[PDB]
Amino acid sequence: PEGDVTVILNNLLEGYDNKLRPDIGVKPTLIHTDMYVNSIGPVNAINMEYTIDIFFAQTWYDRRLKFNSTIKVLRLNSNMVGKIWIPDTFFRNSKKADAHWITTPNRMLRIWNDGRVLYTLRLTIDAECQLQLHNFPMDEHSCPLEFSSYGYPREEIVYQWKRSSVEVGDTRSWRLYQFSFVGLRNTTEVVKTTSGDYVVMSVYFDLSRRIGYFVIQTYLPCIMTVILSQVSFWLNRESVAARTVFGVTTVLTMTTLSISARNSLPKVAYATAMDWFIAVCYAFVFSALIEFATVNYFTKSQPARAAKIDRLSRIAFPLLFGIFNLVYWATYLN
Amino acid sequence: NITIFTRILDGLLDGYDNRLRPGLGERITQVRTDMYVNSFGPVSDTEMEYTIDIFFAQTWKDERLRFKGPMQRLPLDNRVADQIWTPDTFFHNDKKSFAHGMTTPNKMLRIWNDGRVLYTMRLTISAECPMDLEDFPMDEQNCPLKFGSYAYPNSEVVYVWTNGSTKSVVVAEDGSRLNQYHLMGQTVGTENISTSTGEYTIMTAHFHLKRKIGYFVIQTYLPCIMTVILSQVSFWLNRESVAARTVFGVTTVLTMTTLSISARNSLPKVAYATAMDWFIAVCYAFVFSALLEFAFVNYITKSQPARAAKIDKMSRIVFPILFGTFNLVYWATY
Amino acid sequence: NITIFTRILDGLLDGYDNRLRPGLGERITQVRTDMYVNSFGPVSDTEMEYTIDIFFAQTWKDERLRFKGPMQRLPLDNRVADQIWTPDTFFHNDKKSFAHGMTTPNKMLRIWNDGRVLYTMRLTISAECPMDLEDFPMDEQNCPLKFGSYAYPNSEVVYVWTNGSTKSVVVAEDGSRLNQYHLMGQTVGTENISTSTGEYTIMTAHFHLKRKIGYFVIQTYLPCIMTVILSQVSFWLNRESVAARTVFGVTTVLTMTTLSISARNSLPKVAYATAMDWFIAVCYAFVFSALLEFAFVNYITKSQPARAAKIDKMSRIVFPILFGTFNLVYWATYLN
Amino acid sequence: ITIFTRILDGLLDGYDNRLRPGLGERITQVRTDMYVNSFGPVSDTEMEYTIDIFFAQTWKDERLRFKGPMQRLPLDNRVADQIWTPDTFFHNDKKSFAHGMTTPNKMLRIWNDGRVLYTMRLTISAECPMDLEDFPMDEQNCPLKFGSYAYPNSEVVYVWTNGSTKSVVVAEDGSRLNQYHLMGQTVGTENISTSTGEYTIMTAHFHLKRKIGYFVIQTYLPCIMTVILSQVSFWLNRESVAARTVFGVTTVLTMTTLSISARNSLPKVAYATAMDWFIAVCYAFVFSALLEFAFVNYITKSQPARAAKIDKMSRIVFPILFGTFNLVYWATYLN
Amino acid sequence: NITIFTRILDGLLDGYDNRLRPGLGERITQVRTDMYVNSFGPVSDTEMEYTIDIFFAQTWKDERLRFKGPMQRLPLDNRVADQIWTPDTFFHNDKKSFAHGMTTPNKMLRIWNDGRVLYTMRLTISAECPMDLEDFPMDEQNCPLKFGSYAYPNSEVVYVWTNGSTKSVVVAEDGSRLNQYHLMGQTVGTENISTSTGEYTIMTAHFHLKRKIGYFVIQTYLPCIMTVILSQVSFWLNRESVAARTVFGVTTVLTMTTLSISARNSLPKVAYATAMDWFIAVCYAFVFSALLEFAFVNYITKSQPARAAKIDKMSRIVFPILFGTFNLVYWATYLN
Ligand SMILES: CCCCCCCCCCO[C@@H]1O[C@H](CO)[C@@H](O[C@H]2O[C@H](CO)[C@@H](O)[C@H](O)[C@H]2O)[C@H](O)[C@H]1O
Ligand SMILES: CCCCCCCCCCO[C@@H]1O[C@H](CO)[C@@H](O[C@H]2O[C@H](CO)[C@@H](O)[C@H](O)[C@H]2O)[C@H](O)[C@H]1O
Ligand SMILES: CCCCCCCCCCO[C@@H]1O[C@H](CO)[C@@H](O[C@H]2O[C@H](CO)[C@@H](O)[C@H](O)[C@H]2O)[C@H](O)[C@H]1O
Ligand SMILES: CCCCCCCCCCO[C@@H]1O[C@H](CO)[C@@H](O[C@H]2O[C@H](CO)[C@@H](O)[C@H](O)[C@H]2O)[C@H](O)[C@H]1O
Ligand SMILES: CC(C)(C)OC(=O)c1ncn2c1[C@@H]1CCCN1C(=O)c1c(Br)cccc1-2
Ligand SMILES: CC(C)(C)OC(=O)c1ncn2c1[C@@H]1CCCN1C(=O)c1c(Br)cccc1-2
Ligand SMILES: CC(C)(C)OC(=O)c1ncn2c1[C@@H]1CCCN1C(=O)c1c(Br)cccc1-2
Ligand SMILES: CC(C)(C)OC(=O)c1ncn2c1[C@@H]1CCCN1C(=O)c1c(Br)cccc1-2
Ligand SMILES: CC(C)(C)OC(=O)c1ncn2c1[C@@H]1CCCN1C(=O)c1c(Br)cccc1-2
Ligand SMILES: *[C@@H]1O[C@H](CO)[C@@H](O)[C@H](O)[C@H]1NC(C)=O
Ligand SMILES: *[C@@H]1O[C@H](CO)[C@@H](O)[C@H](O)[C@H]1NC(C)=O
Ligand SMILES: *[C@@H]1O[C@H](CO)[C@@H](O)[C@H](O)[C@H]1NC(C)=O
Ligand SMILES: *[C@@H]1O[C@H](CO)[C@@H](O)[C@H](O)[C@H]1NC(C)=O
Ligand SMILES: *[C@@H]1O[C@H](CO)[C@@H](O)[C@H](O)[C@H]1NC(C)=O
């Protein structure tokens, strides 16, 4: 058993050429690929990237590895991956890709009597995903993970999936706070370039954001500040300093609140759905102050208008904000 | 003699195929595993992970290493560990890890006449610890450490804990080092899982934790409790002091708003409220209600001075009781 | 078929000394280089650097790798790149870089019957991009990428860009997107530099970019413009409301102060003023002037109530116009 | 030059570096010395510290004995890999590395006796658990446990050179810390029975005292200037209700903000420090001042003589009661 | 020709023991060293360190490398550097460093018939720069770079700077720019140090720098100077406006507190006051004094309205001068 297998391996590596692909000049090696996502790491819209942990696998046929024996498979470790030919698979949108070396290189190599080889390695990848976060925090995104051969175009190497194209793991372990995993799709294609026409393989992951954090962190404090600014309507104009504090301080906070909200988010040039919510709330607050200045400029001389303004503001200002909230939420809710 | 051992080693490694597990084709390789946590590393709530510095030991029997010599055990370095076969154990929930290398690789290989091998190594591991923070900061968390072989299913390699479950995992009393958590205890487990690459035996070591409330008492609860008490001082002023009463309300409502965002920045951006969030939420209600109380009394102070005065004298007893009772119910609940 | 190529490789590497460049003592090794930017990495103003993920190709001829066989090319792995001689190209302005390694090293070696070698690799490089930020946030920056041999001067190794067909610098539409900058274009160059260790030929790839103003409009300009307008609302109150008028000025001057420091923390610690700094300066002057206007009015309201009241009526129209005219000149100046 | 090449080959010819010198015959004794090139930044938040040392070990290897004209053999790191060296490891090590530029920073010197001198430069980040009750008037001791990993005391043993005094030296220029004084160093050795054998771990303790200057400028002065500001309210009349309120309401929150701010930079420890208590009473003094005004203003209309009196009295009792607190506070924690 | 050089290399390395330095037992190996700073990296005040990208050259004589051939020198790669002996020079004050490796190790070996070796390499080094910040931000700091052999004392290996025709230390004009510092100059040095493992000769490269005040003028000084004048605006109000006067003092006093903590958060946590700290300290005194002025004025405005009013008029001219007089002495003191 042990001695037999030892000779089967030595007899397959004596005249073997790691530097040469199988089916060189004969046919295109077919690689049946599969993928198991262990986790979906933190999404970093700042650098427009995201982390992913997977068990990636490639299965090709190598003629030089045919052996006659009673055993079916040669369950081996990673020590043989360097002594056989391995595809030059690389990821076209990866910012960095790392392997796992504890306790041993996290790779397995399985060989069949037919010459079929199963090679799967654990990987963690930081893939680039440009995000159109315009509906933020009510935005929907799909992020790819492209991979193809680096040096063997379509003529030499080709890829295709199984029916188990992708297999997701326990979603609770996944560290995705602001997003929720929903979709997963696969695509095959051939992109033309100067070095050749390579067959590229992509797998999109679909993520829908959550408002829970931002609702508590931004929308609520914004909704309560406009309300506070409208309590100023239920005070007299005699206490000018009082209602002046009301307006001056509320426009101050809606300002700081906006900067505090955008600081933790990517520095995008355009405006997001939240920035709009923060913008119009600032107007509801700023409009409440100028209202008092107008009422004050009229109170001393003409208390006619200066009195009926507050009567109508106490109805419009609160009711005009609520209608806006319905317009905002319902527009994005569905 | 030193020369005697030199020949013994060469004889064992001469013709030794480390690509094959011991007992291939005859018996499944049983791997008894022990663990000693030299220190329990910092837990990163934001990252939902934890660090740990352990001595990870594995022992199995290799007939090919059976030797007869003067000394019955062979204290060796890491140099020989690479030349023989060792299990390819990997930690499933591992994020990023490494084996200490100074001054030399922190590894130990000991072989016996029987052929039994002892292979222990020092590892610092960062692993996923998914957490539910509903009861934060009065929460208990359990952090796993799943590990097993990558290329050898149970049909080829099997793992088992030493001396039963008891005493399999040890933690240095100096090493239980957490600023924010108590390390209650540890419990081990073993389970087979059928996967598309075979049925592997994964072994898990769970670390249970209870959060320390002291830090948040000083950083969040006291600032909140003292700010609501500050807002209630407004009741002991006259409605005539509109600006003064306003200063109390205007200031305490925004202070409470700021404390929320401040307290929330250090935490993971989870889309659900925690026990701290609710506590802050009512404290915001208590302060905002106080400001609304003054707006009401000040609105009727001229028309119903007896009622306006009544609501002031009433706020001085109902507000503190309703808040004191909330803390009684709040702190008693958790 | 397969055995034929194994023997071809063995024949080429048999007696091959990779320590010597091809043509040593007869001809200088000319290295034609092409480049394809897979993605233009994040630009760090604070660190005065930028990252880039490129496919860097070099092609030269090695008289020793001449072979005759069926197929004209030799698709090989990186394993052979270490066994033969390759140029020691290095990026002069490089800070830190690395070569992608998963699943295998991102490298490709192709040898032809002629002996010509094609040696391409994927590299992510962070390089220095010194910036002059006078026109910040309305500034344009040019980031270089100098590279050449380290041990072989022009007398031994020379670099040259490819012809037009194989564009010298290409940039993937997938990779150039940046949140804060527009990638205008790229221009290449070649130059010899005489050094105490020889005259080397360094080749440069410049990437020109102009910053996007959208982010700063929302984070700094609007808060400043709304804070000066807020301070001017003080004019619509009566001098009798002394505390109220003070609250406007005292708060808006510090609001402008806080906006400065906040806007001032995120940028590189440059020791000179930018176009944004001046803008903040004028908004602070307008806000501080508004508060000073009330202090003057309130000081003479007792002695010259006719003068004190009237200047409050004109301050309502001179301040906004004088500020609106300032914005008109400001935004027109730095946009052209 | 040619003579020594043969000596090296003769020693390494048939030399098995996989076996320790004296395997099965004698225990390998390793005398150890240490020189701290620089004491690295101490991270209170991370409860760790960095250190850059020259770590020397000397043991006797009979297989390396030789007779020649020279007295020893000055060599590079090239030979260190070819011979046997101890597998020393730092138990409390978090993350460390051996400097490599321009070449591996290593030194091998072999004597006719067979004694080997093996020193290397190491930068080590190690855990230093701290108790911060007396922070920022606190003293900390950071250990450095090291020993063999695979060879117990029955096979390899460590001992300090020159005795426990001057065994460890620290460059006066390199012990640069912004926040701590490096008082001194004390060495130690102890055997510990473990499930893989009884190893002899050797420890190097680094005692530190925190510098109070930084916190005086960032926390204490801002707090003391804010409490006195709150007391200025007493020098105003109850008639200025809004003014008196502005004083109290603002100073109490200034004190609140200083607390949260001062604690953000520190480790998230679940217990109060000497800085926390100081801030706590400063919050009591400012809150008391505001409560004082609330009391006078509530009784100023019914008991103007008592309410007015309580203002004049607060202008002297509050400063004294606070000034006396600082006297006891600074004397207690600086003693 | 190529085969000729292959035989030359084999002849030099045949029987060559790279474990032994040239001249063991015959001559002490003298290593003349040159240095070229490709870029002076960012200086980190908080971490008390600095980064530097250099070309570090060393030249010595190895008898065993004597060859006779057509070419005088031997342009080679790093491959031969590992096969021959090279000095084990190390930078004492190094924090963390690395040698650039892309595309190949940035290294250069040149051998002349005489046996003289030229060995230069590209290095990025982070080293300690102990700093004294008493005069911060108007201070001068000097960052060293002491280096020497690790295993060979002066009796076996000796280092010396390039005596003539090459400035011992060179700094690229393209790389020297720094956002926060001016690179005044560089000074070299050599010194013997007696150690328990021998007397080594360390060679030093001092880089002197003076900090740029532009950033701190706008971030700390102007906000402080503009806040002190704001507090003095209180003098232009009436004592009757107690709340208004109070708003001025309490607000400016806390603004000054915030500026202090803010300005120090970005700086190293040193336990001593700097020139900026003192500046902030007195600026806090001036604002606190202004609030103290009103508190005194407001207390006697009813009993001594003539005195209370009188001091408000002199405070309007004594405070600005008393602050202006401080700035004149302050800025003249530390800027000369
Ligand atoms: C009156 C005029 C306006 C003056 C405004 C002055 C105050 C500015 C608000 C600051 O708000 C905080 O800013 C941090 C950044 O400074 C954010 O940090 C978050 O985001 C950062 C960047 O993404 C990370 O570095 C942090 O770890 C993370 O907590 C944080 O969420 C946010 O609440
Ligand atoms: C109602 C008016 C408007 C109010 C708007 C908000 C005002 C500013 C609040 C800032 O609060 C701080 O934010 C830091 C950055 O977010 C936190 O840093 C902590 O958490 C960060 C993220 O985890 C880390 O990066 C830091 O190191 C750590 O100190 C810190 O705890 C928190 O107190
Ligand atoms: C009345 C209630 C008012 C509402 C609460 C106010 C919240 C804002 C407090 C800001 O305080 C600052 O927070 C920084 C970030 O937390 C700290 O940074 C320091 O500490 C951080 C964490 O250790 C580091 O990340 C920074 O680099 C370092 O400068 C800094 O020391 C601290 O003064
Ligand atoms: C009135 C009573 C309450 C007292 C005041 C409370 C608020 C404290 C002011 C905070 O000011 C900011 O603090 C940051 C640190 O906390 C600094 O970050 C700077 O320095 C940090 C550490 O050096 C870096 O991490 C940042 O990137 C860098 O922007 C930043 O410059 C500074 O404006
Ligand atoms: C199906 C696929 C090719 C995507 O498979 C891998 O890529 C792979 N590679 C390694 N392993 C796996 C399988 C796949 C299913 C889950 N799974 C594992 O997680 C696992 C485990 Br539990 C233990 C040891 C090895 C693996
Ligand atoms: C418990 C377990 C089997 C998992 O541990 C080891 O097998 C191991 N591996 C290495 N070491 C040990 C022992 C065991 C107890 C902890 N312990 C040590 O701390 C230690 C020491 Br003090 C010095 C040298 C080696 C070790
Ligand atoms: C142009 C140049 C010679 C400098 O080319 C490379 O260096 C290179 N190296 C690898 N690849 C490329 C070509 C170049 C054009 C785009 N391009 C690729 O992106 C790509 C792709 Br889509 C799939 C497989 C390999 C590559
Ligand atoms: C103290 C100890 C024996 C543990 O130290 C070394 O064995 C060692 N190892 C390396 N070096 C040394 C000597 C010893 C004194 C400090 N010292 C040095 O700093 C130094 C210098 Br200046 C230049 C070149 C090498 C060294
Ligand atoms: C000055 C010194 C001897 C210490 O420098 C080198 O020995 C060295 N080492 C590498 N290189 C150089 C020359 C010398 C002048 C600067 N200089 C270079 O910048 C450079 C260039 Br442009 C291209 C290729 C190699 C180098
Ligand atoms: C393996 O099996 C095939 C098919 O039966 C046969 O042609 C070949 O000769 C066998 N090889 C050996 C070594 O037995
Ligand atoms: C994509 O995934 C689905 C679901 O597993 C599978 O049915 C389909 O065959 C896959 N397509 C490709 C091209 O991999
Ligand atoms: C570079 O060197 C070549 C060959 O000597 C020369 O023709 C060319 O003009 C040089 N270029 C520059 C810019 O000096
Ligand atoms: C520990 O073991 C060593 C070596 O046998 C011995 O010298 C020493 O006395 C023992 N114990 C102590 C406390 O030193
Ligand atoms: C160092 O020692 C050598 C040998 O005695 C001497 O030539 C040299 O001048 C000394 N250098 C210094 C700085 O003392």
Author numbering:
A (entry chain B): 23 to 330, 438 to 463
B (entry chain C): 14 to 322, 430 to 454
C (entry chain A), E (entry chain E): 14 to 322, 430 to 456
D (entry chain D): 15 to 322, 430 to 456
Wording from the paper:
γ-Aminobutyric acid type A (GABAA) receptors belong to the pentameric ligand-gated ion channel superfamily (pLGIC), and in response to the neurotransmitter GABA open an intrinsic ion channel that permits the passage of chloride ions and drives inhibitory neurotransmission in the mammalian central nervous system. In contrast, clinical modulators such as benzodiazepines that treat anxiety, muscle spasm, epilepsy and insomnia bind at the extracellular interface between the α-subunit principal face and the γ-subunit complementary face (between α1/2/3/5 and γ2) and do not induce obvious conformational changes to the pocket in structures solved so far. Instead, here we performed rational engineering to generate high-yielding, high-stability, simplified homomeric and heteromeric constructs based around the α5 subunit that could be structurally resolved by X-ray crystallography or cryo-EM.
To solve the structure of an α5-γ2 site with higher affinity we co-assembled four engineered α5 subunits with one subunit containing a complete γ2 ECD. We crystallized this construct, α5V2, in complex with another type II BZD, the partial PAM, bretazenil, and solved its structure to 2.5 Å resolution. Bretazenil is an analog of flumazenil and retained the same binding mode at all five pockets, which closely resembled the α1β2γ2 pocket (RMSD peptide Cα backbone homomeric and heteromeric sites versus α1β2γ2: 0.73 Å and 0.72 Å, respectively). Of note, bretazenil also possesses an additional five-member ring conjugated to the diazepine moiety, but is nonselective. This can be explained by additional compensatory interactions that the bretazenil oxytrimethyl group forms with S209.
